[PDB]
Amino acid sequence: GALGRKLLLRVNDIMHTGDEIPHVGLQATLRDALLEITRKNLGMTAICDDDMNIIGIFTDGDLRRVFDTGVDMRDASIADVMTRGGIRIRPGTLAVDALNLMQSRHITCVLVADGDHLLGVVHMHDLLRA
Amino acid sequence: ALGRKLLLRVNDIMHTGDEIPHVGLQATLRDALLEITRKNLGMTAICDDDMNIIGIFTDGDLRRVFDTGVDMRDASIADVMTRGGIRIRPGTLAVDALNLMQSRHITCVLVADGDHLLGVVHMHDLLR
Ligand SMILES: Nc1ccn([C@@H]2O[C@H](COP(=O)(O)O[C@@]3(C(=O)O)C[C@@H](O)[C@@H](O)[C@@H]([C@H](O)CO)O3)[C@@H](O)[C@H]2O)c(=O)n1
Ligand SMILES: Nc1ccn([C@@H]2O[C@H](COP(=O)(O)O[C@@]3(C(=O)O)C[C@@H](O)[C@@H](O)[C@@H]([C@H](O)CO)O3)[C@@H](O)[C@H]2O)c(=O)n1
């Protein structure tokens, strides 16, 4: 009942915004990106330009995948290891459709955007709270 | 529909057998991450020869150890795993598994009888 009602909300009204958005710049180090991931507690970070347009994203899963090189990755830049672009939805998207997208793509956090402009982020956990 | 899927026991939806991610106590961190990738659930158990759970390791745990700045390439899983872990019984309802995952801030959970690993359920599994 409550979950069903929450899934009829627009993501605009449940997404993380402002300082709760994980994002770093294009010149960030991988360690910078990891700190941002840890602090914002969503398992991922965006990589944005100065206008808050999405350049890329990096998840905890991405770290596992890039770690599978023999070389020492500790001083890598984020620009070299990020996923370019990122899966996103419009702010009027219903939570149910965000869930369906996340299920079909096997991701747990989706960017909320107007074109390339990052407005917020929604995590699967957000769709089941409140 | 939503109400029915949420009322299933996790026994009926969990991954079992070869689909369970596990490595042994002597595995390397690289062995552990290979198993995580191969089984596609973002985590692995660490088990003894009787399939008893010693610990777990998740993609989040990799971030936490990597961000210590120590070179982790040659690490052993025994030195970086989380001992113990959160588990549920096979009769746990999907809705209760979801609430547990929410409360513990996790997206995948082991299904066990005591320490005996029976299966694993991902948040994705619960929401088909
Ligand atoms: N069945 C499980 C699953 C996980 N864990 C442990 O719970 C801690 C958190 O698990 P996580 O998967 O690493 O949790 C994260 C985290 O570690 O940051 C992942 C991250 O991508 C993001 O999803 C955040 C948000 O906090 C979600 O609320 O949550 C880890 O030490 C992990 O070993 C456990 O004991 N038993
Ligand atoms: N809004 C998003 C979110 C993620 N991604 C990209 O989609 C890929 C998958 O995201 P993930 O979070 O890394 O997905 C994982 C993965 O490793 O692919 C994480 C893992 O812990 C586990 O949750 C598995 C599922 O078990 C697979 O069903 O799913 C990554 O390259 C990520 O950059 C994206 O483009 N846009």
mmCIF file of C-alpha atoms and ligand atoms in Angstrom:
data_model
loop_
_atom_site.group_PDB
_atom_site.id
_atom_site.type_symbol
_atom_site.label_atom_id
_atom_site.label_comp_id
_atom_site.label_asym_id
_atom_site.label_seq_id
_atom_site.Cartn_x
_atom_site.Cartn_y
_atom_site.Cartn_z
ATOM 1 C CA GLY A 1 0.000 0.000 0.000
ATOM 2 C CA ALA A 2 2.643 2.514 1.150
ATOM 3 C CA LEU A 3 5.271 1.149 -1.244
ATOM 4 C CA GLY A 4 2.684 1.210 -4.060
ATOM 5 C CA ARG A 5 1.875 4.866 -3.297
ATOM 6 C CA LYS A 6 5.551 5.791 -3.105
ATOM 7 C CA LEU A 7 6.101 4.206 -6.534
ATOM 8 C CA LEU A 8 3.524 6.662 -8.008
ATOM 9 C CA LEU A 9 5.613 9.689 -6.954
ATOM 10 C CA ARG A 10 7.761 11.692 -9.352
ATOM 11 C CA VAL A 11 11.501 11.137 -8.814
ATOM 12 C CA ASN A 12 11.846 14.949 -8.509
ATOM 13 C CA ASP A 13 10.212 14.707 -5.103
ATOM 14 C CA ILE A 14 12.401 11.919 -3.737
ATOM 15 C CA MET A 15 15.784 12.427 -5.374
ATOM 16 C CA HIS A 16 18.950 13.657 -3.657
ATOM 17 C CA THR A 17 19.832 17.231 -4.623
ATOM 18 C CA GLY A 18 22.356 19.892 -3.701
ATOM 19 C CA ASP A 19 25.123 18.729 -1.403
ATOM 20 C CA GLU A 20 23.658 15.222 -1.279
ATOM 21 C CA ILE A 21 24.564 14.689 -4.972
ATOM 22 C CA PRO A 22 27.881 12.836 -5.396
ATOM 23 C CA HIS A 23 29.916 14.539 -8.052
ATOM 24 C CA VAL A 24 33.523 15.366 -8.836
ATOM 25 C CA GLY A 25 35.180 17.276 -11.648
ATOM 26 C CA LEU A 26 36.919 16.051 -14.757
ATOM 27 C CA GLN A 27 40.408 16.562 -13.250
ATOM 28 C CA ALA A 28 39.635 14.586 -10.041
ATOM 29 C CA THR A 29 41.854 11.685 -9.037
ATOM 30 C CA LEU A 30 40.342 8.249 -8.558
ATOM 31 C CA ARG A 31 41.000 8.647 -4.798
ATOM 32 C CA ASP A 32 39.039 11.941 -4.855
ATOM 33 C CA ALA A 33 36.180 10.082 -6.550
ATOM 34 C CA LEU A 34 36.242 7.294 -3.963
ATOM 35 C CA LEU A 35 36.086 9.773 -1.088
ATOM 36 C CA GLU A 36 33.040 11.428 -2.699
ATOM 37 C CA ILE A 37 31.375 8.025 -3.149
ATOM 38 C CA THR A 38 31.989 7.216 0.517
ATOM 39 C CA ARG A 39 30.740 10.545 1.794
ATOM 40 C CA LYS A 40 27.492 10.675 -0.183
ATOM 41 C CA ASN A 41 26.685 7.063 0.556
ATOM 42 C CA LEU A 42 25.062 6.099 -2.778
ATOM 43 C CA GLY A 43 27.750 3.719 -4.103
ATOM 44 C CA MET A 44 28.540 5.990 -7.034
ATOM 45 C CA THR A 45 29.583 9.412 -8.178
ATOM 46 C CA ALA A 46 28.938 11.528 -11.220
ATOM 47 C CA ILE A 47 31.709 13.314 -13.052
ATOM 48 C CA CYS A 48 30.444 16.750 -14.150
ATOM 49 C CA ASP A 49 31.779 19.832 -15.865
ATOM 50 C CA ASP A 50 31.557 23.365 -14.407
ATOM 51 C CA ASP A 51 27.996 23.734 -15.722
ATOM 52 C CA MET A 52 26.893 20.514 -13.944
ATOM 53 C CA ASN A 53 26.577 18.665 -17.239
ATOM 54 C CA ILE A 54 27.174 14.935 -16.935
ATOM 55 C CA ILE A 55 30.450 13.745 -18.430
ATOM 56 C CA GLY A 56 30.498 10.321 -16.808
ATOM 57 C CA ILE A 57 29.839 8.173 -13.777
ATOM 58 C CA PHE A 58 31.811 5.766 -11.596
ATOM 59 C CA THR A 59 30.352 3.069 -9.350
ATOM 60 C CA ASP A 60 31.803 0.619 -6.797
ATOM 61 C CA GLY A 61 31.308 -2.068 -9.463
ATOM 62 C CA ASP A 62 33.444 -0.019 -11.868
ATOM 63 C CA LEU A 63 36.282 -0.014 -9.294
ATOM 64 C CA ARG A 64 36.214 -3.807 -9.198
ATOM 65 C CA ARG A 65 36.312 -3.950 -12.972
ATOM 66 C CA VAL A 66 39.186 -1.478 -13.354
ATOM 67 C CA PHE A 67 41.170 -3.190 -10.522
ATOM 68 C CA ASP A 68 41.486 -6.251 -12.766
ATOM 69 C CA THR A 69 44.709 -4.871 -14.309
ATOM 70 C CA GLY A 70 48.129 -6.023 -13.126
ATOM 71 C CA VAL A 71 49.285 -2.391 -12.738
ATOM 72 C CA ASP A 72 49.029 -0.177 -9.658
ATOM 73 C CA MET A 73 45.891 1.976 -10.125
ATOM 74 C CA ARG A 74 46.179 4.050 -6.926
ATOM 75 C CA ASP A 75 47.215 7.261 -8.674
ATOM 76 C CA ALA A 76 44.734 6.939 -11.589
ATOM 77 C CA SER A 77 42.639 9.925 -12.671
ATOM 78 C CA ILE A 78 38.836 9.635 -12.707
ATOM 79 C CA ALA A 79 38.726 10.704 -16.371
ATOM 80 C CA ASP A 80 40.677 7.609 -17.373
ATOM 81 C CA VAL A 81 38.468 5.052 -15.590
ATOM 82 C CA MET A 82 34.955 6.552 -15.536
ATOM 83 C CA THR A 83 32.027 5.182 -17.562
ATOM 84 C CA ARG A 84 31.257 7.837 -20.158
ATOM 85 C CA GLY A 85 27.733 9.295 -20.111
ATOM 86 C CA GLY A 86 25.380 7.621 -17.660
ATOM 87 C CA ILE A 87 21.854 6.227 -17.510
ATOM 88 C CA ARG A 88 19.417 9.005 -16.652
ATOM 89 C CA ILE A 89 15.735 9.822 -16.366
ATOM 90 C CA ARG A 90 13.703 13.056 -16.409
ATOM 91 C CA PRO A 91 12.570 14.543 -13.102
ATOM 92 C CA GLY A 92 8.892 13.776 -13.872
ATOM 93 C CA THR A 93 9.621 10.059 -14.207
ATOM 94 C CA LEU A 94 7.497 7.992 -11.813
ATOM 95 C CA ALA A 95 9.361 6.002 -9.156
ATOM 96 C CA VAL A 96 7.818 2.809 -10.612
ATOM 97 C CA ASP A 97 9.343 3.514 -14.025
ATOM 98 C CA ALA A 98 12.695 4.391 -12.437
ATOM 99 C CA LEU A 99 12.575 1.021 -10.646
ATOM 100 C CA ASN A 100 11.744 -0.785 -13.889
ATOM 101 C CA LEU A 101 14.682 0.914 -15.638
ATOM 102 C CA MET A 102 17.040 0.019 -12.807
ATOM 103 C CA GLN A 103 15.845 -3.610 -12.893
ATOM 104 C CA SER A 104 16.193 -3.873 -16.651
ATOM 105 C CA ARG A 105 19.691 -2.340 -16.604
ATOM 106 C CA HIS A 106 20.888 -4.033 -13.369
ATOM 107 C CA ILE A 107 21.920 -0.806 -11.660
ATOM 108 C CA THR A 108 20.989 0.486 -8.212
ATOM 109 C CA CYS A 109 21.236 4.287 -8.726
ATOM 110 C CA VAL A 110 20.013 6.487 -11.631
ATOM 111 C CA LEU A 111 20.877 10.072 -12.577
ATOM 112 C CA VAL A 112 18.019 12.574 -12.816
ATOM 113 C CA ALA A 113 18.698 15.028 -15.604
ATOM 114 C CA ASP A 114 17.401 17.640 -17.973
ATOM 115 C CA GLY A 115 19.370 16.722 -21.128
ATOM 116 C CA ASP A 116 22.967 16.603 -19.812
ATOM 117 C CA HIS A 117 22.215 18.855 -16.817
ATOM 118 C CA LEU A 118 22.408 16.805 -13.608
ATOM 119 C CA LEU A 119 19.545 17.691 -11.222
ATOM 120 C CA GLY A 120 19.747 14.845 -8.760
ATOM 121 C CA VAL A 121 20.228 11.132 -8.126
ATOM 122 C CA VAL A 122 17.856 8.405 -6.985
ATOM 123 C CA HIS A 123 18.988 5.138 -5.384
ATOM 124 C CA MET A 124 16.944 1.948 -5.241
ATOM 125 C CA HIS A 125 16.949 2.421 -1.413
ATOM 126 C CA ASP A 126 15.122 5.759 -1.872
ATOM 127 C CA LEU A 127 12.265 4.043 -3.712
ATOM 128 C CA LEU A 128 11.551 1.855 -0.660
ATOM 129 C CA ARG A 129 11.910 4.391 2.207
ATOM 130 C CA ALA A 130 9.260 6.686 3.819
ATOM 131 C CA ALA B 1 1.066 -8.348 -8.423
ATOM 132 C CA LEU B 2 3.497 -6.351 -6.227
ATOM 133 C CA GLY B 3 1.750 -7.742 -3.133
ATOM 134 C CA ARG B 4 2.091 -11.362 -4.350
ATOM 135 C CA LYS B 5 5.797 -11.197 -5.277
ATOM 136 C CA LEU B 6 6.608 -9.571 -1.924
ATOM 137 C CA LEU B 7 4.865 -12.463 -0.082
ATOM 138 C CA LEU B 8 7.107 -15.203 -1.569
ATOM 139 C CA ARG B 9 9.688 -16.979 0.597
ATOM 140 C CA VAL B 10 13.251 -16.200 -0.474
ATOM 141 C CA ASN B 11 13.878 -19.955 -0.751
ATOM 142 C CA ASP B 12 11.845 -19.861 -3.952
ATOM 143 C CA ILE B 13 13.754 -17.011 -5.554
ATOM 144 C CA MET B 14 17.339 -17.216 -4.306
ATOM 145 C CA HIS B 15 20.346 -18.150 -6.391
ATOM 146 C CA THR B 16 21.743 -21.559 -5.479
ATOM 147 C CA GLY B 17 24.443 -24.043 -6.567
ATOM 148 C CA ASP B 18 26.903 -22.694 -9.119
ATOM 149 C CA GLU B 19 25.172 -19.302 -9.019
ATOM 150 C CA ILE B 20 26.356 -18.709 -5.438
ATOM 151 C CA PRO B 21 29.523 -16.593 -5.200
ATOM 152 C CA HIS B 22 32.027 -18.118 -2.826
ATOM 153 C CA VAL B 23 35.748 -18.540 -2.373
ATOM 154 C CA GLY B 24 37.825 -20.304 0.300
ATOM 155 C CA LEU B 25 39.637 -18.871 3.298
ATOM 156 C CA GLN B 26 43.025 -19.022 1.513
ATOM 157 C CA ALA B 27 41.836 -17.168 -1.618
ATOM 158 C CA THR B 28 43.597 -14.041 -2.827
ATOM 159 C CA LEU B 29 41.747 -10.739 -3.101
ATOM 160 C CA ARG B 30 42.129 -11.064 -6.884
ATOM 161 C CA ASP B 31 40.520 -14.601 -6.733
ATOM 162 C CA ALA B 32 37.668 -13.063 -4.682
ATOM 163 C CA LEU B 33 37.042 -10.229 -7.134
ATOM 164 C CA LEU B 34 37.092 -12.699 -10.070
ATOM 165 C CA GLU B 35 34.358 -14.710 -8.342
ATOM 166 C CA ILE B 36 32.360 -11.515 -7.651
ATOM 167 C CA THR B 37 32.534 -10.570 -11.343
ATOM 168 C CA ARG B 38 31.752 -14.092 -12.533
ATOM 169 C CA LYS B 39 28.625 -14.545 -10.419
ATOM 170 C CA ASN B 40 27.351 -11.017 -11.082
ATOM 171 C CA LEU B 41 25.881 -10.164 -7.655
ATOM 172 C CA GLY B 42 28.409 -7.565 -6.409
ATOM 173 C CA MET B 43 29.658 -9.722 -3.521
ATOM 174 C CA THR B 44 31.127 -13.037 -2.565
ATOM 175 C CA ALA B 45 31.021 -15.227 0.494
ATOM 176 C CA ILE B 46 34.149 -16.705 2.035
ATOM 177 C CA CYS B 47 33.378 -20.282 3.117
ATOM 178 C CA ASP B 48 35.126 -23.252 4.624
ATOM 179 C CA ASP B 49 35.070 -26.716 2.984
ATOM 180 C CA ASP B 50 31.691 -27.455 4.558
ATOM 181 C CA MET B 51 30.094 -24.361 2.951
ATOM 182 C CA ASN B 52 29.978 -22.613 6.339
ATOM 183 C CA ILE B 53 30.192 -18.802 6.062
ATOM 184 C CA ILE B 54 33.371 -17.269 7.465
ATOM 185 C CA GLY B 55 32.854 -13.823 5.941
ATOM 186 C CA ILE B 56 31.749 -11.733 3.001
ATOM 187 C CA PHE B 57 33.326 -9.170 0.671
ATOM 188 C CA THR B 58 31.421 -6.633 -1.381
ATOM 189 C CA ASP B 59 32.245 -4.042 -4.061
ATOM 190 C CA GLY B 60 31.764 -1.414 -1.296
ATOM 191 C CA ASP B 61 34.422 -3.201 0.797
ATOM 192 C CA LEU B 62 36.856 -2.902 -2.143
ATOM 193 C CA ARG B 63 36.312 0.844 -2.215
ATOM 194 C CA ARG B 64 36.922 1.093 1.526
ATOM 195 C CA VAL B 65 40.164 -0.895 1.456
ATOM 196 C CA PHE B 66 41.400 0.758 -1.745
ATOM 197 C CA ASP B 67 40.876 4.164 -0.219
ATOM 198 C CA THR B 68 43.314 3.359 2.658
ATOM 199 C CA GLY B 69 46.039 3.933 0.044
ATOM 200 C CA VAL B 70 47.761 0.565 0.760
ATOM 201 C CA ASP B 71 48.636 -1.410 -2.378
ATOM 202 C CA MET B 72 45.942 -4.129 -2.264
ATOM 203 C CA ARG B 73 46.964 -6.069 -5.403
ATOM 204 C CA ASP B 74 48.571 -8.961 -3.541
ATOM 205 C CA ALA B 75 46.223 -8.962 -0.541
ATOM 206 C CA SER B 76 44.558 -12.095 0.791
ATOM 207 C CA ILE B 77 40.779 -12.238 1.155
ATOM 208 C CA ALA B 78 41.199 -13.377 4.786
ATOM 209 C CA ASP B 79 42.790 -10.006 5.662
ATOM 210 C CA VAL B 80 40.118 -7.798 4.076
ATOM 211 C CA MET B 81 36.805 -9.725 4.342
ATOM 212 C CA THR B 82 34.018 -8.703 6.758
ATOM 213 C CA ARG B 83 33.710 -11.607 9.214
ATOM 214 C CA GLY B 84 30.233 -12.918 9.983
ATOM 215 C CA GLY B 85 27.799 -10.918 7.925
ATOM 216 C CA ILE B 86 24.053 -10.356 7.727
ATOM 217 C CA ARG B 87 21.994 -13.401 6.713
ATOM 218 C CA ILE B 88 18.395 -14.425 6.445
ATOM 219 C CA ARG B 89 16.592 -17.803 6.796
ATOM 220 C CA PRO B 90 15.212 -19.451 3.624
ATOM 221 C CA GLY B 91 11.609 -18.943 4.913
ATOM 222 C CA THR B 92 12.090 -15.170 5.159
ATOM 223 C CA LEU B 93 9.500 -13.338 3.021
ATOM 224 C CA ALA B 94 10.727 -11.145 0.176
ATOM 225 C CA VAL B 95 9.140 -8.102 1.821
ATOM 226 C CA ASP B 96 11.059 -8.768 5.051
ATOM 227 C CA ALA B 97 14.294 -9.340 3.109
ATOM 228 C CA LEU B 98 13.713 -6.000 1.409
ATOM 229 C CA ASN B 99 13.108 -4.234 4.761
ATOM 230 C CA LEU B 100 16.291 -5.823 6.192
ATOM 231 C CA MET B 101 18.350 -4.692 3.196
ATOM 232 C CA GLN B 102 16.930 -1.210 3.558
ATOM 233 C CA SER B 103 17.694 -1.099 7.333
ATOM 234 C CA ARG B 104 21.228 -2.450 6.905
ATOM 235 C CA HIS B 105 22.015 -0.377 3.768
ATOM 236 C CA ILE B 106 22.880 -3.409 1.608
ATOM 237 C CA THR B 107 21.660 -4.707 -1.798
ATOM 238 C CA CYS B 108 22.366 -8.446 -1.535
ATOM 239 C CA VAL B 109 22.067 -10.864 1.329
ATOM 240 C CA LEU B 110 23.111 -14.453 2.145
ATOM 241 C CA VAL B 111 20.498 -17.074 2.863
ATOM 242 C CA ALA B 112 21.704 -19.484 5.503
ATOM 243 C CA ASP B 113 20.853 -22.143 8.061
ATOM 244 C CA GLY B 114 23.148 -21.078 10.871
ATOM 245 C CA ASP B 115 26.516 -20.782 9.168
ATOM 246 C CA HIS B 116 25.553 -23.090 6.271
ATOM 247 C CA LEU B 117 25.263 -21.031 3.085
ATOM 248 C CA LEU B 118 22.139 -22.096 1.086
ATOM 249 C CA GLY B 119 21.835 -19.266 -1.380
ATOM 250 C CA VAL B 120 21.937 -15.530 -2.063
ATOM 251 C CA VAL B 121 19.256 -12.973 -2.824
ATOM 252 C CA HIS B 122 19.894 -9.640 -4.555
ATOM 253 C CA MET B 123 17.506 -6.685 -4.289
ATOM 254 C CA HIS B 124 17.034 -7.150 -8.075
ATOM 255 C CA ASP B 125 15.675 -10.694 -7.443
ATOM 256 C CA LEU B 126 13.080 -9.471 -5.006
ATOM 257 C CA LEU B 127 11.695 -6.886 -7.354
ATOM 258 C CA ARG B 128 10.781 -9.026 -10.397
HETATM 259 N N1 LIG C 1 24.724 -9.778 3.276
HETATM 260 C C1 LIG C 1 25.571 -8.802 3.602
HETATM 261 C C2 LIG C 1 25.869 -7.781 2.711
HETATM 262 C C3 LIG C 1 26.766 -6.772 3.090
HETATM 263 N N2 LIG C 1 27.379 -6.787 4.348
HETATM 264 C C4 LIG C 1 28.344 -5.711 4.761
HETATM 265 O O1 LIG C 1 27.632 -4.461 4.956
HETATM 266 C C5 LIG C 1 28.573 -3.374 4.723
HETATM 267 C C6 LIG C 1 27.770 -2.520 3.688
HETATM 268 O O2 LIG C 1 27.528 -3.301 2.443
HETATM 269 P P1 LIG C 1 27.734 -2.536 1.020
HETATM 270 O O3 LIG C 1 27.158 -3.306 -0.100
HETATM 271 O O4 LIG C 1 29.284 -2.405 0.975
HETATM 272 O O5 LIG C 1 27.001 -1.085 1.267
HETATM 273 C C7 LIG C 1 27.150 0.183 0.548
HETATM 274 C C8 LIG C 1 28.401 0.921 1.096
HETATM 275 O O6 LIG C 1 29.296 0.183 1.553
HETATM 276 O O7 LIG C 1 28.491 2.172 0.992
HETATM 277 C C9 LIG C 1 27.376 -0.075 -0.938
HETATM 278 C C10 LIG C 1 27.269 1.218 -1.739
HETATM 279 O O8 LIG C 1 27.437 0.893 -3.128
HETATM 280 C C11 LIG C 1 25.934 1.915 -1.491
HETATM 281 O O9 LIG C 1 24.869 1.062 -1.896
HETATM 282 C C12 LIG C 1 25.837 2.190 0.019
HETATM 283 C C13 LIG C 1 24.686 3.049 0.603
HETATM 284 O O10 LIG C 1 24.915 3.261 2.005
HETATM 285 C C14 LIG C 1 23.298 2.440 0.471
HETATM 286 O O11 LIG C 1 22.497 2.853 1.605
HETATM 287 O O12 LIG C 1 25.889 0.916 0.730
HETATM 288 C C15 LIG C 1 29.842 -3.981 4.067
HETATM 289 O O13 LIG C 1 30.935 -4.003 4.995
HETATM 290 C C16 LIG C 1 29.456 -5.420 3.724
HETATM 291 O O14 LIG C 1 30.574 -6.330 3.855
HETATM 292 C C17 LIG C 1 27.060 -7.843 5.267
HETATM 293 O O15 LIG C 1 27.573 -7.904 6.384
HETATM 294 N N3 LIG C 1 26.166 -8.827 4.870
HETATM 295 N N1 LIG C 2 22.972 5.656 -13.647
HETATM 296 C C1 LIG C 2 23.905 4.731 -13.963
HETATM 297 C C2 LIG C 2 24.350 3.737 -13.076
HETATM 298 C C3 LIG C 2 25.339 2.835 -13.511
HETATM 299 N N2 LIG C 2 25.889 2.928 -14.803
HETATM 300 C C4 LIG C 2 26.944 1.966 -15.290
HETATM 301 O O1 LIG C 2 26.300 0.703 -15.401
HETATM 302 C C5 LIG C 2 27.331 -0.335 -15.117
HETATM 303 C C6 LIG C 2 26.692 -1.210 -14.048
HETATM 304 O O2 LIG C 2 26.470 -0.481 -12.811
HETATM 305 P P1 LIG C 2 26.968 -1.218 -11.423
HETATM 306 O O3 LIG C 2 26.460 -0.463 -10.236
HETATM 307 O O4 LIG C 2 28.455 -1.296 -11.436
HETATM 308 O O5 LIG C 2 26.259 -2.689 -11.523
HETATM 309 C C7 LIG C 2 26.647 -3.928 -10.857
HETATM 310 C C8 LIG C 2 27.713 -4.526 -11.794
HETATM 311 O O6 LIG C 2 28.809 -4.895 -11.325
HETATM 312 O O7 LIG C 2 27.408 -4.551 -13.007
HETATM 313 C C9 LIG C 2 27.161 -3.692 -9.426
HETATM 314 C C10 LIG C 2 27.242 -4.981 -8.580
HETATM 315 O O8 LIG C 2 27.608 -4.654 -7.207
HETATM 316 C C11 LIG C 2 25.954 -5.773 -8.623
HETATM 317 O O9 LIG C 2 24.863 -5.051 -8.002
HETATM 318 C C12 LIG C 2 25.645 -6.033 -10.093
HETATM 319 C C13 LIG C 2 24.335 -6.780 -10.296
HETATM 320 O O10 LIG C 2 24.345 -7.957 -9.513
HETATM 321 C C14 LIG C 2 24.151 -7.176 -11.770
HETATM 322 O O11 LIG C 2 22.812 -7.638 -11.932
HETATM 323 O O12 LIG C 2 25.466 -4.763 -10.776
HETATM 324 C C15 LIG C 2 28.599 0.396 -14.631
HETATM 325 O O13 LIG C 2 29.536 0.478 -15.690
HETATM 326 C C16 LIG C 2 28.090 1.795 -14.283
HETATM 327 O O14 LIG C 2 29.065 2.817 -14.533
HETATM 328 C C17 LIG C 2 25.442 3.920 -15.690
HETATM 329 O O15 LIG C 2 25.903 4.049 -16.836
HETATM 330 N N3 LIG C 2 24.477 4.813 -15.224
#
